[PDB]
């Protein structure tokens, strides 16, 4: 996944 | 199931191999089939299908840059696309704790993020790869026409200035940009002596971009102060760039909260509207 | 190793914590190699062999864009290394897996799909040496055969018997009428231990093919013979079914040079200084 963007 | 139902094809591409001991993997675009040595991208719709073929280019261009480290190399295509999969472990934040892990660690990023700035003068990549107008615009209109009614109003306003920001932001396209550099997606050699960069694999958002996207995503992966140190050796510690950096790394939460939106992750969305309600 | 010693202190910056005995050393002409377990590093023997880094480095470039159905080593430098006049080294990426043993092709099917998967390498080597701007990257030496003779001569009949000179003679002979072909790209040492596999999941997978010293734009018939050579007829004759390739003249190539396959292992030892591999490639000849 996931704040990285995801 | 989906072994059983591309049995024919997993047979030609990976001879004698078990279907049943593979493991598949289930992206937006693509359900991917894990062998030990190479993956088996899958298209999930007519779009992913159509779009293969370009996927597969771009996979080759990356092959061919200097980036320091391995990336996903295709091996086939036909519909399906092969690739190569890149050895080696993420690395533990904590591991940055040791300050000499932290100094090579750090030079190896400079190098991956130089080579992907470098190719982002070369013609190869900027025709193949893509690069759009305005996509932090269009993330803006995105998050309030899908995110804003499930937020608080104080999150609408917190989120607006976060968007707002976004103006600022010069719509650079000098480097190729990963776009998800997270510490999941950069391979690592471990335990026989200091940590040696192995590849870098998941380049589904890679564009032509603005570099501080990735220096968001190591910040956003491993902290400020490991990010700093990237930032200083690398040349990369102007207030310009600073700037950029912190209005990108604004936006992760409302890209996981849109994305799980749009996904049905109901997990990923309660956590990226976390502080937004 | 006293190469391994003699170049501690650079092998400690790009090696960080590895010890000598985690090492290897491969002898090459211009460059001995040393191998980590990811990486492998060329280290330069004089300053014609350092000035020689830049254009391998472009030259491995090539190789990693190419479409081969594998992987090859990758250069770990930036690009603009290739502009330097010289370099002090040169880091590629390791390729995984291991040779594969001869017997393994006893099994009828094992052997079938161990050919296919030269096949696609070979034809993908045969493209990219159609390819306008791979051919303007890499050497196409001409009259590479007749130069070749002039060296076993020179550097390896000193080395022989009267009995094994005149052997050579033979195979030499036919060298001279050989068709100079540059066609394909050729890796021109593509014996069993440079043809990497894995064999953990199922039947042999090709993994990567390492050792690019000697490319070039060449006859595929220098790759085919290689292959022949360590395998066999019943082996080779199963490849070039598969890939289109059993015409008389390209069989009649490989012959010809498939009998000097053992002398281009000895030129090659007896530069690079390997004792073992002379030894070996001068069996039957002293």
Same mark, same amino acid.
């Given at each position: 996944?996931?704040?990285?963007?995801? | 199931?989906?072994?059983?139902?591309?049995?024919?094809? &997993?047979?030609?591409?990976?001879?004698?191999?078990?279907?049943?001991?593979?493991?598949?993997?289930?992206?937006? !675009?693509?359900?991917?089939?894990?062998? @030990? #040595?190479?993956? =088996?991208?899958?298209?999930?719709?007519?779009?992913?299908?159509?779009? &293969?073929?370009?996927?597969?280019?771009?996979?080759? %261009?990356?092959?061919?840059?200097?980036?320091?480290?391995? +990336?996903?190399?295709?091996?086939?295509?036909?519909?399906?696309?092969?690739?190569?999969?890149?050895?080696?472990?993420?690395?533990?934040?904590?591991?940055?704790?040791? @300050?000499?892990?932290?100094?090579? %660690?750090?030079?190896? $990023? %400079? +190098? &991956?993020? @130089?080579?992907?700035?470098?190719?982002?003068?070369?013609?190869?990549?900027?025709?193949?790869?893509?690069?759009?107008?305005?996509?932090?615009?269009?993330?803006?209109?995105?998050?309030?026409?899908?995110? !804003?009614?499930?937020? @608080?109003? /104080?999150?609408?306003?917190?989120?607006?200035?976060?968007?707002?920001?976004?103006?600022?932001?010069?719509?650079?396209?000098?480097?190729?940009?990963?776009?998800?550099?997270?510490?999941?997606?950069?391979?690592?050699?471990? *335990?026989?002596?200091?940590?040696?960069?192995?590849?870098?694999?998941?380049?589904?958002? =890679?564009?032509?971009?603005?570099?501080?996207?990735?220096?968001?995503?190591? /910040?956003?992966? $491993?902290?400020? *102060?490991?990010? *700093?140190? =990237?930032?200083?050796?690398?040349?990369?510690? #102007?207030?310009?760039?600073? +700037?950029?950096?912190? +209005?990108?790394?604004?936006? !992760?939460? &409302?890209?996981?909260?849109?994305?799980?939106?749009? #996904?049905?992750?109901?997990?990923?969305?309660? #956590? /990226?509207?976390?502080? $937004?309600?």
């Amino acid at each position: 996944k996931a704040x990285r963007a995801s | 199931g989906i072994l059983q139902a591309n049995r024919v094809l &997993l047979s030609r591409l990976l001879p004698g191999v078990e279907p049943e001991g593979l493991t598949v993997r289930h992206g937006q !675009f693509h359900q991917v089939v894990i062998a @030990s #040595d190479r993956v =088996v991208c899958l298209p999930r719709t007519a779009a992913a299908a159509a779009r &293969l073929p370009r996927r597969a280019a771009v996979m080759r %261009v990356l092959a061919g840059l200097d980036l320091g480290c391995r +990336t996903p190399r295709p091996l086939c295509e036909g519909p399906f696309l092969v690739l190569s999969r890149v050895p080696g472990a993420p690395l533990e934040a904590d591991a940055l704790e040791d @300050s000499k892990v932290a100094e090579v %660690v750090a030079a190896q $990023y %400079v +190098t &991956l993020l @130089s080579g992907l700035a470098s190719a982002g003068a070369d013609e190869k990549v900027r025709a193949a790869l893509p690069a759009p107008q305005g996509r932090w615009r269009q993330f803006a209109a995105d998050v309030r026409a899908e995110l !804003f009614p499930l937020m @608080s109003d /104080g999150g609408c306003r917190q989120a607006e200035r976060e968007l707002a920001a976004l103006d600022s932001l010069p719509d650079i396209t000098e480097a190729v940009v990963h776009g998800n550099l997270g510490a999941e997606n950069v391979l690592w050699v471990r *335990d026989d002596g200091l940590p040696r960069l192995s590849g870098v694999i998941d380049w589904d958002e =890679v564009s032509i971009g603005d570099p501080a996207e990735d220096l968001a995503a190591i /910040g956003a992966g $491993y902290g400020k *102060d490991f990010l *700093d140190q =990237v930032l200083t050796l690398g040349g990369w510690s #102007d207030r310009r760039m600073a +700037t950029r950096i912190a +209005t990108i790394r604004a936006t !992760f939460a &409302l890209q996981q909260a849109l994305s799980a939106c749009r #996904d049905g992750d109901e997990e990923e969305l309660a #956590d /990226g509207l976390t502080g $937004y309600r």
